[PDB]
């Protein structure tokens, strides 16, 4: 499990700025903090972790002072259109934490040990702003506390409280379709797998015994309801589709895989999704 706190800060000019942030536990969002909002919003019943009301409000105040401060401080460092991204959290195992900062889409600074360092290949004009920043011994101390202690202690509480929503199972639903391959007299078969949780999945094209080596695993694309979509494609020579199947393995299924053969169930499904092919591609 990787726990992330992600901050996004836009500085258009001296008088225009906003910072919205989000928080992930695995592939599930736990927190939202909109620039419109003074308070951090829970996005789950268990987003308070195992902290008490006041214990949470103590931590929230800490962050409230930070956001105002960050905003004013950055605009000063500028003097020595700006996008800044912060990635802070820890990875659970014992644990290991991190604080990475990115400037104009490029990773440039991390908090490491007791102070801010520039990462190799960082632009040298950062040296002054960093020298100024490292002087603030109060910030150094509260950061070390968050990274070394609060984060691990918090996350071990989030996992225990979120046990249920983390272990949940949602079954995949597959369907077939195909398009012209860029190669003459070829077609690309497409196996659509959608609505599964957790993320890990096995999707292959088969000729019964053999896994089709031409099978191309696509990227994981998300669904709005926190489930996943993935498609495996296969480039066949037109006429060779018959005898092929899409096989889907997933933890929600028992041992009972989804096999979809190209050709009755497939016939009715294709008859349900006919169109005029505009504007196809």
């Amino acid at each position: 499990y990787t726990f992330r706190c992600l901050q996004m800060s836009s500085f258009a000019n001296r008088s225009w700025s906003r910072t919205d942030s989000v928080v992930w536990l695995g592939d599930l969002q736990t927190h939202r903090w909109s620039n419109d909002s003074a308070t951090i919003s829970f996005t789950k019943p268990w987003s308070q972790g195992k902290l008490s009301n006041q214990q949470w409000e103590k931590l929230q105040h800490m962050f409230q002072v930070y956001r105002v401060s960050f905003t004013r401080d950055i605009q000063e460092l500028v003097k020595m259109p700006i996008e800044i991204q912060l990635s802070a959290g820890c990875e659970m195992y014992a644990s290991e934490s991190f604080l990475h900062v990115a400037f104009q889409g490029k990773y440039v600074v991390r908090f490491w040990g007791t102070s801010w360092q520039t990462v190799p290949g960082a632009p040298s004009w950062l040296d002054l702003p960093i020298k100024v920043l490292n002087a603030d011994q109060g910030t150094s101390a509260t950061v070390q506390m968050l990274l070394n202690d609060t984060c691990p202690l918090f996350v071990r509480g989030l996992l225990e409280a979120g046990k249920s929503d983390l272990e949940k199972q949602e079954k995949p639903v597959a369907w077939l379709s195909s398009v012209p391959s860029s190669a003459h007299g070829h077609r690309q078969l497409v196996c659509h797998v959608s609505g599964f949780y957790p993320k890990p999945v096995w999707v292959m094209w088969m000729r019964g015994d053999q896994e089709q080596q031409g099978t191309h695993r696509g990227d994981f694309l998300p669904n709005a309801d926190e489930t996943w979509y993935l498609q495996a494609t296969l480039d066949v020579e037109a006429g060779e589709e018959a005898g092929l199947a899409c096989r889907v393995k997933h933890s929600s299924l028992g041992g009972q895989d989804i096999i979809l053969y190209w050709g009755l169930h497939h016939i009715l499904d294709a008859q349900k999704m006919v169109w005029n092919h505009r504007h196809h591609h």
Partner: T-cell receptor
Amino acid sequence: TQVEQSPQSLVVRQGENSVLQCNYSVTPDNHLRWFKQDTGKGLVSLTVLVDQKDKTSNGRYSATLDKDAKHSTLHITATLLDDTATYICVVGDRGSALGRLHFGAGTQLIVIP
Amino acid sequence: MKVTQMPRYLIKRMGENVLLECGQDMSHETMYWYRQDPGLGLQLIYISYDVDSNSEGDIPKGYRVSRKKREHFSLILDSAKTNQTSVYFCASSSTGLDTQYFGPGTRLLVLE
């Protein structure tokens, strides 16, 4: 105005002790500095207070800080005649140069022989 | 050591260039320009974090500033106004939480 000093002026007999108060609204509140300004002169730092409950000393000068009450006291023990000055309380909202420094109006301490 | 500030007294006519100089030998990075007015208190005009790296204080209007060397910090008034009559103080410090050192001041009077 986020820093208030109390009282405005203080008359003490040479050799006695005097007590100066500072209250503030500054947030965040990183540090509190006490300054001494003689007539026609620049400010000279007496002491710097950093902790939540802090106590400092500089010879005859000593100060306390309660960040909860957001309140500081400057104590002058056995006041000399050269202690006749304006005493300035300053709160910083940062632990570095990036910080905004809020300057009080100051207490005038007049020591009489 | 101390903080240098010259001249001590200055009388200028309305709409004249005013250069107020300042110096320190502690090789401090941070330097400040203030003005002190009856009862009102110290108001920051300009700060400097190092060479060629300045930032407007609380009341920058009518004032510009220069710092081409670490040891000096010049306050420039391009055309002086009668409300720019005040006592001007220089100051320096380390980039951290160390002592702040002030100069002796400059009494500037601007007249019609």
